Amino acid sequence: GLVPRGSHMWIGVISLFPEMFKAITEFGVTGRAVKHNLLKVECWNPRDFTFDKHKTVDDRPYGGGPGMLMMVQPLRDAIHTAKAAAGEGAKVIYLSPQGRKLDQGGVTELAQNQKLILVCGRYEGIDERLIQTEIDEEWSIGDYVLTGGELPAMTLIDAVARFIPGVLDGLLDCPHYTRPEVLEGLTVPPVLMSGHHEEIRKWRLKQSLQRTWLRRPELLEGLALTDEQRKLLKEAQAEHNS
Amino acid sequence: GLVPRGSHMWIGVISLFPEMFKAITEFGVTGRAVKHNLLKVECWNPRDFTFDKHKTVDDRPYGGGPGMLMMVQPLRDAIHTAKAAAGEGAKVIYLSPQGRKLDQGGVTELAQNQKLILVCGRYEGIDERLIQTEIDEEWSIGDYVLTGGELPAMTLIDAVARFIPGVLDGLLDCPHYTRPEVLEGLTVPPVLMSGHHEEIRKWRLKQSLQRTWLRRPELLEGLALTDEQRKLLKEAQAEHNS
Numbered sequence: 001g002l003v004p005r006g007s008h009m010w011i012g013v014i015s016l017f018p019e020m021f022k023a024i025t026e027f028g029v030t031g032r033a034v035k036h037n038l039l040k041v042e043c044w045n046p047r048d049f050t051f052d053k054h055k056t057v058d059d060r061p062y063g064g065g066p067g068m069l070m071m072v073q074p075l076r077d078a079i080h081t082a083k084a085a086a087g088e089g090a091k092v093i094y095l096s097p098q099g100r101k102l103d104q105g106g107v108t109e110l111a112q113n114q115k116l117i118l119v120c121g122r123y124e125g126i127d128e129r130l131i132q133t134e135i136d137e138e139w140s141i142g143d144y145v146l147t148g149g150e151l152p153a154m155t156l157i158d159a160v161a162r163f164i165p166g167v168l169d170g171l172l173d174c175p176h177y178t179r180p181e182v183l184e185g186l187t188v189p190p191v192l193m194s195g196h197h198e199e200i201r202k203w204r205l206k207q208s209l210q211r212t213w214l215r216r217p218e219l220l221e222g223l224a225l226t227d228e229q230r231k232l233l234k235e236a237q238a239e240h241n242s
Numbered sequence: 243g244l245v246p247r248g249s250h251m252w253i254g255v256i257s258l259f260p261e262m263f264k265a266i267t268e269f270g271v272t273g274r275a276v277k278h279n280l281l282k283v284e285c286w287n288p289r290d291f292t293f294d295k296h297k298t299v300d301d302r303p304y305g306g307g308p309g310m311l312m313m314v315q316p317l318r319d320a321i322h323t324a325k326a327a328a329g330e331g332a333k334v335i336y337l338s339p340q341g342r343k344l345d346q347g348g349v350t351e352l353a354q355n356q357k358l359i360l361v362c363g364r365y366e367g368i369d370e371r372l373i374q375t376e377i378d379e380e381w382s383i384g385d386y387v388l389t390g391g392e393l394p395a396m397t398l399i400d401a402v403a404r405f406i407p408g409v410l411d412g413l414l415d416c417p418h419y420t421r422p423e424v425l426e427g428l429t430v431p432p433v434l435m436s437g438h439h440e441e442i443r444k445w446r447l448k449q450s451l452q453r454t455w456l457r458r459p460e461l462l463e464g465l466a467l468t469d470e471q472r473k474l475l476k477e478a479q480a481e482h483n484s
């Protein structure tokens with residue numbers, strides 16, 4: 001290919017439903033990243049590692065209780081095959097609600113890895129000793145439970161892929177407006193039609209500060225605001241208080 | 243169908259990439275919920291609402307700056323068509339990093355709705371006046387940015403679908419173990435082979451409390467622990483301190 005590839009990422013995926021990953025590899029910005037060789041996603045399915053007639057991928061938990069776990073042998077063999085394909089330096093990630101909570105800073109840390117292997121749990125998850133022996137890091141995409149680790153893995157791939165050069169402040173987005181000039185009686189703020197680029201930049205920043213303060217004030221606590229940001233935030237708070 | 247349907251959910255989706263949703267509708271537990279008529283996902287693509295030769299779905303932002311926005315007319319017409327199909331009572335949700343942060347409690351609130359319409363933003367998102375006029379609630383799946391609202395929408399569908407009867411404490415999961423009895427020298431905790439159901443329940447609960455304290459102690463602050471939980475947590479903390 002001709003598209004500059006230097007920072008490309010390889011992501012191995014272990015999943016019982018590899019076809020789910022077409023949602024990222026066949027469409028959109030991520031699909032383009034795959035076609036241009038900026039991103040490669042390679043999947044291994046534990047089902048292909050079973051030897052019994054029925055291709056059994058689940059197993060009963062010690063101690064009983066409801067639920068099944070992923071069967072150790074097919075999952076372990078799939079992980080080992082993915083690790084051999086990756087060569088040296090691949091970090092193996094398991095997605096689960098018990099993992100470190102993902103945020104944009106963590107996305108940018110993960111995007112530093114040229115190789116990742118993402119293990120997608122189903123059922124009640126994977127045997128704890130496999131976490132100990134095969135998993136480098138455990139991450140959660142949020143505090144909620146899904147039917148498998150595939151959507152979390154897809155979410156992580158998409159988030160990290162945005163930080164790969166060529167694929168494409170700590171505050172919420174400012175409001176954005178497009179045509180038409182009047183929509184259900186609502187008008188575009190005149191500043192955005194002014195052509196004054198500095199006034200527009202400051203208005204957008206002030207709106208982002210105001211929205212972050214009103215919706216997610218804890219996000220402001222994590223920032224050391226610039227002098228300009230402190231002033232625009234004070235102005236917004238004064239206006240909000242009238 | 244014969245599968246009991248009483249609590250079924252209908253989810254309309256507005257997306258430029260409706261085929262991404264096959265990942266949920268064709269596979270796994272969610273795929274089964276669709277086949278059994280517990281969950282219906284119906285998609286409308288703004289591209290089908292364009293009238294120009296090139297089927298234009300993006301538009302330039304007022305005030306310039308980088309990025310495009312979703313074009314208002316095709317998106318608005320798609321939303322209106324979805325609302326007409328839904329009939330009365332559909333809550334219209336826009337997924338974005340500026341929305342209320344999703345957690346399991348919020349999932350269970352959302353699962354009370356028999357009808358949802360999920361609007362998937364691409365580019366720099368949707369015109370603010372469309373949020374004002376067409377959107378009931380804005381939600382985020384986590385503090386990170388993706389290339390579109392499709393994966394967030396899929397994540398929300400899967401999370402809510404688990405609370406639909408028939409599809410399938412505030413603490414992290416306890417460790418789980420399956421065969422074999424010894425794995426890379428690591429043994430299953432003897433209690434889980436004891437056959438003593440009460441001792442197993444208490445061990446699992448104590449482990450969940452210990453893991454939550456060590457990994458996500460802020461989660462314990464949100465709970466009013468039961469008497470039994472307070473005792474097992476104190477025991478775990480004492481053991482951790484030796």
Ligand SMILES: NC[C@H]1CCC[C@@H](CNc2ccc(C(N)=O)cn2)C1
Binds near residue numbers: 126141142144146
């Ligand atoms: N006890 C349920 C749990 C057992 C272990 C496997 C998971 C798979 N599903 C997931 C995975 C990850 C996330 C997340 N928040 O990152 C949510 N859901 C389900």
Ligand SMILES: NC[C@H]1CCC[C@@H](CNc2ccc(C(N)=O)cn2)C1
Binds near residue numbers: 173367385387391394
């Ligand atoms: N400025 C970027 C932003 C513009 C507006 C549309 C979104 C689409 N992508 C999303 C959507 C939702 C989430 C989430 N955390 O729920 C993340 N990513 C992108």
